[PDB]
């Protein structure tokens, strides 16, 4: 009836890779305050293309070994797109302080997700700087996790409110990055994304790859 071990088998074969190029390889990202975000679902999330692409720069992921992730399947993948100052890259992490952590982006703590970033200087710049990216300097308090504010409402350092028109101390919220094709490494434009893996008590998940194996026939009872 039964037979020696080796006859077990896997792979109810499927395929259909999904839009991770369409977020990593976008021709243009939005800035920090206007950080882009998008739902990804009903696909196999192949990260074995993500790791081994040797064109990323400061690639880490918390809370789970990604290689072990590839079996563990989550849903509601939602991933980001924005760009940061060269130095500031490390500061996008759980429970970290700084300037982005307060006024432009706060990562939820105990976050088990990924932060993937990189250097991009070859395209996100031009002679004199590509002034298409801005960041916030003021806000009344800290930010919640994963929320946005785009607004012309301004801080009032003094007592008298600034009635919309910038003045000596209005401090109009948005200021732009000055990127140069010659500036230092710490000041390069680091084009970055972030994924979060939120399965918010949500049936009908959508799972990922499990690479292969090659059949051997005419051996019974084991599957």
């Amino acid at each position, epitope marked *: 009836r039964v037979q020696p071990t080796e006859s077990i088998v896997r792979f109810p074969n499927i395929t259909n890779l999904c839009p991770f190029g369409e977020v990593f390889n976008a021709t243009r990202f939005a800035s920090v305050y206007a950080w882009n975000r998008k739902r990804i679902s009903n696909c196999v999330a192949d990260y074995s293309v993500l*790791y*081994n*692409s*040797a*064109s*990323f*720069s*400061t*690639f*880490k*992921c918390y809370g789970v*070994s*990604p*290689t*072990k992730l590839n079996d563990l399947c989550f849903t509601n993948v939602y991933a980001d797109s924005f760009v940061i100052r060269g130095d500031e890259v490390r500061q996008i992490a759980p429970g970290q302080t700084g300037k982005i952590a307060d006024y432009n982006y706060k990562l939820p703590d105990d976050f088990t997700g990924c932060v993937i970033a*990189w*250097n*991009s*200087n*070859n395209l996100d710049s031009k002679v004199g700087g590509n002034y298409n990216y801005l960041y916030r300097l003021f806000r009344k308090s800290n930010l919640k996790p994963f929320e946005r504010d785009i607004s012309t409402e301004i801080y009032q350092a003094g007592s008298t409110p600034c009635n919309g028109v910038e003045g000596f101390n209005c401090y109009f919220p948005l200021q732009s990055y000055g990127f140069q094709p010659t500036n*230092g*490494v710490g000041y*390069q434009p680091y084009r970055v994304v972030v994924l979060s893996f939120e399965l918010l008590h949500a049936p009908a998940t959508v799972c990922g790859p499990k690479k292969s194996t090659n059949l051997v026939k005419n051996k019974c009872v084991n599957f």
Partner: antibody, heavy 123, light 110 residues
Framework: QVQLVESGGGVVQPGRSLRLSCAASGFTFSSYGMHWVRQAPGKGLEWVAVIWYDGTNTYYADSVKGRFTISRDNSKNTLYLQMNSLRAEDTAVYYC????????????????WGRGTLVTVSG | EIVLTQSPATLSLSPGERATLSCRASQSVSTYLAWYQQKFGQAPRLLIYDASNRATGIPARFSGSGSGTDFTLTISSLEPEDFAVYYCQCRSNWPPGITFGQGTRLEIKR
């Protein structure tokens, strides 16, 4: 105290196996990735293997694809490297190396090197 | 696959002068190439990573520049710790790996 010291240098016949070790000290072992780079006599450096800081996924050069095993056991803070099906070209000074980046997966720079252990093969 | 191309094959110069090496990578890598200095028999030590960052333990006299497929290292004033061999290395995706160069030897005028 921030150093690596290799171990296991020796001679073995072709077709047999040897396993080396690298001792780490002065730093957190389980937070950095580790590499093995081999320097064949009179030649340049040739990367052999890598391991992520949690050793969950590993990469091997083509010349040793499917023949060597890289693994780290943080219990003793020792890196290892096995060999299988050794051939003559494998003679080298195996430098165990340390990743540059702290808790990064890139694994692109070698910032700190073991002194290198002789390994030789002949009948 | 990135295969590193190093020029000139060797350098010969007096100390105190300006030594400039070139490593032209086969195809673009943005900002990721690193320099290794090996004295004869000694242990190679990283000098530059990210192709302009002066790694720790490196006196400020060591400078590098370049991105894409042009990468060069400059030394202002050579003193005997630097008459060595030197390599450029970077990393690859298909098949995933790492490519070193061929090496660049340094010699003294007399």
């Amino acid at each position: 105290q921030v150093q690596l010291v290799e171990s296991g240098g020796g001679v073995v016949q072709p077709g047999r196996s040897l396993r080396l070790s690298c001792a780490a000290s002065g730093f957190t072992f389980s937070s950095y990735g580790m590499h093995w780079v081999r320097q064949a006599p009179g030649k340049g450096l040739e990367w052999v293997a890598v391991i992520w800081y949690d050793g969950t996924n590993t990469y091997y050069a083509d010349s040793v694809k499917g023949r060597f095993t890289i693994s780290r056991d943080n219990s003793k803070n020792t890196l290892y490297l096995q060999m299988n099906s050794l051939r003559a070209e494998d003679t080298a000074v195996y430098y165990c190396a340390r990743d540059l980046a702290y808790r990064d997966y890139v694994w692109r720079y070698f910032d700190l090197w073991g002194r290198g252990t002789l390994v030789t093969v002949s009948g | 696959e990135i295969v590193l191309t190093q020029s000139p094959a060797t350098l010969s110069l007096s100390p105190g002068e300006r030594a400039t090496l070139s490593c032209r990578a086969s195809q673009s890598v943005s900002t990721y190439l690193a320099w290794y200095q090996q004295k004869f028999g000694q242990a190679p030590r990283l000098l530059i990573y990210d192709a302009s960052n002066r790694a720790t333990g490196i006196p400020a006299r060591f400078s590098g520049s370049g991105s894409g497929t042009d990468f060069t290292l400059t030394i202002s004033s050579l003193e005997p710790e630097d008459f060595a061999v030197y390599y450029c290395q970077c990393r690859s995706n298909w098949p995933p790996g790492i490519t070193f160069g061929q090496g660049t030897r340094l010699e003294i005028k007399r």
